[PDB]
Symmetry: C3
Subunit: 182 residues, 3 copies
């Protein structure tokens, strides 16, 4: 596997890879255009998301938005994200239908080795994130690498989600825990 | 009641209401101008806040700032907010005199039904937030819908405030709890 | 001591001091240029960081970035910060070599008196932050005033660090606590 294929697969890779580096620049060019767009340039924002993402249909994302690659973000139907969300998509971020992200939600797939030498080596890795259908993620929440969230979940504002979340629950806290069953 | 009146009152409403939709666009036009203003355009920033907010006198808000409507934000005298605060003002956000928000404070009045069908219906609601006099809210804190904060409160950085806070206390944690009496 | 010298030393000072006020405007002018720079204006961004910081060699900082003064930020070699980090540098922020900040990391040295009258007086203060070598700070973490972080530390995403962190540990939670020894 190439560095790019390894990255997507959740294997150790080098981000300084030429191809990945070019990909990151392209994403940042699209995001710069998105984030400076005039309030009324709805149509442009829609075109940019279709150019950026791995899959999108209907999506509404309040500026600002940030991501690493774009092409590793796969959205189901009728997606909404409020102001200033971030998706570090080194591995796939798969989001189901009718998702709502509140302001400042961060979703991370990127990680580094815990060992300092390994970390400073230029080697890094990722773990994918999968989110089901009808998920509402409250403001300022953090979704960590390798997490799967089921269907019909509510993530409370400010929650830090470190482990999988099953269907039909509310989770809150840091580390998040189940606080209510639906 | 109209959808707008219901929204402000904390009843279920539809954000796709024509009037609310126009109101949101207007707020975003003002916020776009605010957030791109040159470092030295103090005077313009002052004019924009007087056009945006339900009430303001003396206020200093570091860009960026974000909100939903503007007109549901009511500030007492001598207000300060540091970089990149967010106020989702579907219901009134009432803030007393001499308040200080640190960077990245989020105040939410907006909420959704916990039930997925209800949530996907287009119906949503809010609960007002009221903050007293001489309140200091530390960086990255989250103030949730329906919370009242009393006078002379300190909210520690990163606190997630889920319940009312009485006068003359320090609160911290997620969910926040009292950590010191003044 | 002057208000400026007091500020840097972690003594009570008045931010409305003429010199400090001019310094803040200069920092904001540089940050405005940084944050609007085109995706490809790498060279400009490098020049701006060398003009802004108290010390920098090799540094890569994704826009946006925010700070108070600039000159109180001292970076060791091979520094990286991801999107939208904030450093309130009223006192020195000293960061060692090979540091990595994830998106939205906030580092605060600024603080206010807990007493409301003291706080509203215009008097404020700070406490320095020192971070060692080979530190990785996860996304959305908060580093509070007066904290020292040792070498080879991992700060988990969303951690709120309120006390010193010794060498060779992982810390997480709010308030952060040790969750693993390396």
């Amino acid at each position: 596997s190439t560095e790019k294929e390894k990255m997507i697969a959740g294997e150790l890779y080098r981000s300084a890879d030429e191809t990945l580096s070019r990909d990151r620049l392209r994403a940042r060019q699209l995001i710069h255009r998105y984030n400076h767009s005039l309030a009324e340039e709805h149509t442009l924002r829609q075109q940019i998301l279709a150019d950026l993402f791995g899959q999108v249909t209907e999506a509404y994302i309040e500026p600002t938005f940030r991501c690493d690659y774009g092409y590793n973000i796969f959205l189901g139907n009728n997606f909404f994200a409020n102001f200033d969300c971030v998706m570090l998509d080194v591995c796939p971020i798969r989001i189901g239908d009718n998702c709502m992200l509140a302001p400042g939600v961060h979703i991370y797939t990127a990680t580094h080795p815990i060992d300092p030498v390994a970390r400073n080596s230029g080697a890094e890795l990722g773990k994918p994130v999968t989110i089901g259908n009808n998920v509402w993620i409250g403001g300022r929440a953090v979704i960590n690498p390798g997490v799967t969230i089921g269907d019909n979940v509510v993530v409370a504002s400010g929650a830090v989600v470190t482990k999988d979340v099953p269907d039909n629950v509310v989770v809150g806290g840091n580390p998040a825990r189940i606080i209510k069953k639906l």
